Design a protein around this nucleic acid. Structure first.
Ligand SMILES: [Mg+2]
Ligand SMILES: [Mg+2]
Ligand SMILES: [Mg+2]
Ligand SMILES: [Mg+2]
Ligand SMILES: [Mg+2]
Ligand SMILES: [Mg+2]
Ligand SMILES: [Mg+2]
Ligand SMILES: [Mg+2]
Ligand SMILES: [Mg+2]
Ligand SMILES: [Mg+2]
Ligand SMILES: [Mg+2]
Ligand SMILES: [Mg+2]
Ligand SMILES: [Mg+2]
Ligand SMILES: [Mg+2]
Ligand SMILES: [Mg+2]
Ligand SMILES: [Mg+2]
Ligand SMILES: [Mg+2]
Ligand SMILES: [Mg+2]
Ligand SMILES: [Mg+2]
Ligand SMILES: [Mg+2]
Ligand SMILES: [Mg+2]
Lengths: 135, 177
RNA sequence: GAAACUGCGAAUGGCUCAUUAAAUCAGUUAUCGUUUAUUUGAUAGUUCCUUUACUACAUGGUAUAACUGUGGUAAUUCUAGA
RNA sequence: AUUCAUAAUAACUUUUCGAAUCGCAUGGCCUUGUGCUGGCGAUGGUUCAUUCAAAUUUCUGCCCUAUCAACUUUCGAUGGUAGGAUAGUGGCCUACCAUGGUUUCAACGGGUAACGGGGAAUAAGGGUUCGAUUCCGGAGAGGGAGCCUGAGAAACGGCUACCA
RNA sequence: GUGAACAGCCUCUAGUUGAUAGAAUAAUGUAGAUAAGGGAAGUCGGCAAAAUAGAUCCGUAACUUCGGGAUAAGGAUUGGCUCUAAGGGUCGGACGAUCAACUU
RNA sequence: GCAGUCAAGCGUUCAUAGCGACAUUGCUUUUUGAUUCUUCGAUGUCGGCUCUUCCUAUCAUACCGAAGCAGAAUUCGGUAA
RNA sequence: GAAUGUUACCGCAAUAGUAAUUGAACUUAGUACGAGAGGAACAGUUCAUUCGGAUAAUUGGUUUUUGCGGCUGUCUGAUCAGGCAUUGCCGCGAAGCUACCAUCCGCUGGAUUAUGGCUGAACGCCUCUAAGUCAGAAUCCAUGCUAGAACGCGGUGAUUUC
RNA sequence: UGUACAACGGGGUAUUGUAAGCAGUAGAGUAGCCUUGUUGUUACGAUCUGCUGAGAUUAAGCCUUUGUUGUCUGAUUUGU
């Protein structure tokens, strides 16, 4: 069972209470009693009628509890595999400290330094062929 | 309704089915992003915390963060937004969309786990799922490994093995910047 | 090389003759009264700062599609949460 | 023909532009750092010109009609000043002020089974009748209005509302 | 005083406060009001009631004895406050001094 | 005004399902006449409105019997106000 | 409301009154019947019509709550706050009253009529009828409901010192 | 003489819609006077904002009540 709210006064409407208007467009309006109903019919503006939720909001009457309510939290956790990387490859990789990196590194870094100058002499090779390669 | 639960630490996900108005009802008037303590919804999820993220009503309309409302409304939508992918430059469409406030009119709630509960959920905590693609731009490789503008990438790029049958190969990105 | 991002195009073409009588339209003028993607030709040594203990330039930032996975609706080039 | 082009002074600016982009080649030059240099061309970029446009705009020219004689200022009608708005001139709009503007040389109103032109048909000449329709211009996308995108649309094989 | 006013409403001067009284507040009355939705279906018949109404500005048909019809009809406006402008008199030679109203 | 008896006829055939001529017996007193008993030192006209009650020759509704009642619809009839 | 000793409380029930009404939809069923066209009902379900008896949570009407506020004109020197204007006017307005304008409630047994039958003579057959008898209606009689005979009645309490 | 009753007061419930008073570099403005304005002041000014969902009313046929105050043997009849 639902408590509707008065669409002029913001008042709680319990089952059976008040009335429900259905306008031409089809905007539904609900009033809690015949006072809000009437003020609505007179084309009053809730924002200028002081007892309403709407006026009270537009005039910062009340609040105070909301300017007090601040903070609260809680968060987080850990790690999942990646397919082609079990948590173990991930432990193994992550763990190993710089001196093995530099090691690994400067090895390969020397290892293909060889490949480079090797392919280079390979160029001059198919070229002292191609500045020869006769009849 | 059906719950769509994601464990975004592992990259896992599974669905769950709740019948029982009282077990559900914990989610009512809760909005997108609100947290929900687990035990209320079940004994399995005891302790578990859920941050609500969206989901669909019957008739399938997606929720849209920020509307408020526990109903459906039709909005003009634009480039760069939820529940709309524009067909043409500067096209906008007026489309039905569901409010961001949970009601029993939903076929599916979409939750993301924020804190793990006291017990394991099988397809979610037990299983763990590899991040499809690795860093491609230079300095993102530098960051995903912590490196210094000294270390040289090339041998830090990822290397994905895939087989021709009796010829197993090795493909890496193509570093940029 | 699919998908998708990005860019460009969809303001051309084609069709019809309902309006329209100093309107349109024609010939003739005006911009010393303006906008102009593009094409073509040119056109940029100056950007930082109380100004010696410097400022990534050997190059700075994240957020997203496609995708993966979990979903909703009788139903559309509907789309949500992760 | 200019308060033109261009330039100088003082400042102004939620500061526009001044390349964090891509492809091919790999070469010179030493104090040997992978140093410092360096070929061809792509896409960009500000301002000016050019080209493709556009928008307004001068002069003259339209069918029948008086059983249409006065018309124009509700709620701009005609002009002045200032502003706002526009890409920009302009009652385009707004304020203030004035009392103007058109008309028997036919205004204004009505009709049109009216889109305009290039043209067509009929051959002594003068004419008469026609032109929805292969090219040019204009307008529209069932009817109205509104607008997003964009260099350009008040677009409809775009959206938005209302009406049918 | 309000206002067009010798209207209505309230007041001053003057004059009254005299027309049996007490307690209740049934029906039915007499006189005064109001009613959701419908709107003359009531009734011989809209009888009775209701609705309109002052002023300013706009606008206003047939017909006509050309005088009318006409407040035709149909519309907008109207408080309070604070300002602006315009509208006279008298006396000294295009001004100058002085006095005094309210109205638009 | 209302109801009977006879049954020639109607009703494809068949008097009487439903009807019914020529005749004939009645009933009623919301028709209209006929009368002139009461009232002309008074009994206040027509219609409507309002409201109660009564009659039954029953229109509807309850249960039945008939049919030219297949069904549906009707029609005749009973107990019924 | 006098009089039956006084006064009080609880009751009986003679007599009189009496009340409910009608429709539809779903289902039965596109069925029974029918060549087709068409086309029911009983049981069960949900509603409605006309009537009646109450009731006022709610909604609505009423407003001298002259309850709060607003407004015109005048009067109290001004202010505050008030008077008068046959209840001055306007908006809201509690309570009370009240509306098919609101909501709730409106009982179930018997005995019969018509009629259809059982057994059965009269009349050795036949026959619902003569004796006897079954079923049977918005009827009637009760149940129920309203008064309670002021000359109908029962059970019970207390019955005077100044 | 009470778990009394009443008049007040208090609390609740209602109705209306923000009292009076004070304050305000709130207010279209106009007009005075000065030291002539890094806020000049004085007069007047509908209205606006705050204190203020305030104030007023609330049984007369609303509910309640640890308070205050008061009341508590007048008249007439009746017997088997
Ligand atoms: Mg790149
Ligand atoms: Mg790059
Ligand atoms: Mg694209
Ligand atoms: Mg971001
Ligand atoms: Mg080199
Ligand atoms: Mg370019
Ligand atoms: Mg001008
Ligand atoms: Mg201009
Ligand atoms: Mg003029
Ligand atoms: Mg003139
Ligand atoms: Mg002429
Ligand atoms: Mg035409
Ligand atoms: Mg043509
Ligand atoms: Mg033509
Ligand atoms: Mg045509
Ligand atoms: Mg042109
Ligand atoms: Mg068409
Ligand atoms: Mg369009
Ligand atoms: Mg089309
Ligand atoms: Mg098109
Ligand atoms: Mg139309």
């Amino acid at each position: 069972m639902k408590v509707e709210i008065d669409s002029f006064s913001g008042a709680k409407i319990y089952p059976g209470r008040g009335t429900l208007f259905v306008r031409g467009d089809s905007k539904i309006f609900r009033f809690q009693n015949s006072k809000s109903a009437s003020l609505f019919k007179q084309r009053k503006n809730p924002r200028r009628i002081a007892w309403t939720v709407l006026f009270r909001k537009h005039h910062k009457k009340g609040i105070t509890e909301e300017v007090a309510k601040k903070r609260s939290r809680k968060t987080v956790k850990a790690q999942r595999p990646i397919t082609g990387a079990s948590l173990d490859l991930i432990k193994e990789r992550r763990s190993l400290k710089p001196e093995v990196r530099k090691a690994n590194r400067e090895e390969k870094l020397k290892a293909n330094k060889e490949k480079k100058k090797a392919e280079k002499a390979a160029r001059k090779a198919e070229k002292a062929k191609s500045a020869g390669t006769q009849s | 309704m059906k719950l769509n639960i994601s464990y975004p630490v592992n990259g896992s996900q599974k669905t769950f089915e709740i019948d029982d108005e009282h077990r559900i009802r914990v989610f009512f008037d809760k909005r997108i992003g609100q947290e929900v303590d687990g035990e209320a919804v079940g004994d399995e999820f005891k302790g578990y915390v859920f941050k609500i993220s969206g989901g669909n009503d019957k008739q399938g309309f997606p929720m849209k963060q920020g509307v408020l409302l526990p109903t459906r409304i039709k909005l003009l939508l634009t480039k760069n937004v939820s529940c709309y992918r524009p067909r043409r430059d500067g096209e906008r469409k007026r489309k039905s969309v569901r409010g961001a406030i949970v009601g029993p009119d939903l076929a599916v709630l979409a939750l993301v786990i924020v804190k793990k509960g006291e017990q394991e959920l099988e397809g979610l905590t037990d299983t763990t799922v590899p991040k499809r693609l690795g860093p491609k731009r230079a300095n993102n490789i530098r960051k995903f490994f912590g490196l210094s503008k000294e270390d040289d990438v090339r041998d830090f790029v990822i290397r994905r093995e895939v087989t021709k049958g009796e010829k197993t190969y090795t493909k890496a990105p193509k570093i940029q910047r």
